[PDB]
């Protein structure tokens, strides 16, 4: 029978404007964050020399 059917009322307890803006910032930060996390490890996509080396506009 359960009870997850009154789960809208959260917006009677927690300010919607706040929750929204919070989630918004928190997401932009998390994004920048993860980007830097991967960029400092092996899965990097900047210093890979892919698909055409540019410092190889010569004999490099």
């Amino acid at each position: 029978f359960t009870m997850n059917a009154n789960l809208y009322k959260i917006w009677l307890i927690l300010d919607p404007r706040r929750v929204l803006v919070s989630i918004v910032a928190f997401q932009i930060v998390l994004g920048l964050l993860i980007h830097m996390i991967v960029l400092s490890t092996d899965l990097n996509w900047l210093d890979d020399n892919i698909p055409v080396s540019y410092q190889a506009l010569g004999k490099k």
Binding site: Y8, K9, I10, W11, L12, I13, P16, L20
Partner: peptide, 16 residues
Amino acid sequence: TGLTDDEAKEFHAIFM
């Protein structure tokens, strides 16, 4: 707090 019970079902809907 300070929504009617109707505009947080709505808010919840759009949010979802």
